[PDB]
Amino acid sequence: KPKLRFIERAPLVPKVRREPKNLSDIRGPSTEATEFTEGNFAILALGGGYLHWGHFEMMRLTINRSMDPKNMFAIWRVPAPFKPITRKSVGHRMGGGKGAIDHYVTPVKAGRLVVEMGGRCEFEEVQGFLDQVAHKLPFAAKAVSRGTLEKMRKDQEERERNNQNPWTFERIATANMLGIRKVLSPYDLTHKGKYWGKFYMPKRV
Amino acid sequence: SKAVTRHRRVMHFQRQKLMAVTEYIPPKPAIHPSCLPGLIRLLRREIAAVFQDNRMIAVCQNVALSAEDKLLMRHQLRKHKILMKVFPNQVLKPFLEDSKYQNLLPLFVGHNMLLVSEEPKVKEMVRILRTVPFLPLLGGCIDDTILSRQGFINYSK
């Protein structure tokens, strides 16, 4: 089946427990689904965020509209919406516990591949609708091939090797140079200044 | 505010100072680097077979015709076995210098169109090119002797 399968609004088994918005599932680099597997093209996430069901439906409709099933196949990498986001009743005051579950959400960290293309397909013919659907995405994304992923990784290594500035974020953060971990996060010892909140800085070494 | 916000959260000023000091500095060289210092073989042996085939070559400026006019002239010169050929001069100038054609070097530039043959019917091309009021006769060369139009007419008559 060389098409995007239907993504449900909620899993078949419900989640009766309200879960806190642990926002650290957005922040930082991805560790799941960061490298290609038996595919050729993807929409790399240059930043984290929440994907709702409307985003999933819009991506599926946009990919399957300009679609060639005899030449291309596409596989989901982001799973079904499982995180419950709760909203209180409209125009009502605080207290009274946590609100009822409103909608189900997937969290995506930076560096995550969302969907995979494959087949007898080339770069320029797929950047069109991939750039369209990536501009329609909530977070910053980019149509990235196998060659372009390694190309930007080589770019990151040559930027971190060729710099003439003796002071990098990793040195100042790890050595606690100016007593300046007072204004840094403990996550900055592993983010090394490339991550600030939910965002990602590609141009920053 | 939370650590994760929808907008880009403003930083502590010492954090901004650390980010501005630790910016990437690209290496600047002392001198700028930008201010420093089978088809062709098919053309080769095809046109070489053409040189070793004919004993004169003729050429004109046949792009002043429509496609049906090309078909008509191709049929009118298909009655005899004269070959009409088009190939670029960027490779034909080496074809001229390889074929020891020194006096044919300022002859094949621009749009040029070969009319190679082994026995002359050239009066027929003469009154084809006189029944239309254009399309002149660019000079040729029979057995390492150059021919202008006066030479063409002298050889035609």
Binding site: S66, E125 | L39, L42
Partner: peptide
């Protein structure tokens, strides 16, 4: 030969056709 390069030109034209789907 001549047919080999004509065939290669035909795949070049086909590649130009498939890259020009969205333009």
């Amino acid at each position: 030969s001549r047919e080999y390069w004509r065939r290669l030109r035909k795949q070049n034209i086909w590649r130009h056709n498939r890259l020009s789907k969205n333009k």
